[PDB]
Design a protein. Structure first.
Lengths: 102, 100
């Protein structure tokens, strides 16, 4: 199963080259699975619940002299999640671009 | 999860005079587990596949004999919960006494 969402914030320049270490972090989720004790068949899947919060906190973009990121802060992001037998908590990808001044 | 009701039909000497009576009852219970750690979160209560009690059983007629009871009453099998919870079987003994 994949119940831990990883948020990766790519910090790059206009050429797509990494200018800072990836930002972000991780968010853990869990869900219950109810089965028949006799047949071992899955009866139903519980809703995904957060171990901490259901949203990645806002992330401040690092400062680079002579450059300006398109956003000084990536807003809080809720990772997508799927239910059912193949359900999983998805990762979050974000790309912030630093453009040279002026 | 299956309870078997066994009714022994014996004479005053302890010898069986009829094949065992009774029947079977099936039950099921759900088990809720943490999909990530796989720890059991909760055990559901036992539920009957059909009924929660064995129907009353008529005792066979035997010439020159009288069973202490002509009908074993409806019986509910005992059941326990938790990790080792199970539905217990039911054991009953009917005695046929020779008529003077």
């Amino acid at each position: 199963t994949h119940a831990t969402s990883t948020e990766t914030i790519h910090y790059v320049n206009e050429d797509g080259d990494q200018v800072f270490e990836d930002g972000g972090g991780k968010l853990d989720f869990t869900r219950t699975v109810t089965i028949d004790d006799v047949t071992n068949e899955v009866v139903e899947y519980g809703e995904w619940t957060p171990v901490t919060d259901d949203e990645f906190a806002a992330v401040t973009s690092p400062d680079k002299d002579g450059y300006t990121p398109d956003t000084s802060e990536v807003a809080a992001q809720k990772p997508d999640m799927t239910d059912g037998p193949d359900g999983t908590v998805k990762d979050v990808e974000v790309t912030v671009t630093y453009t040279a001044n002026p």
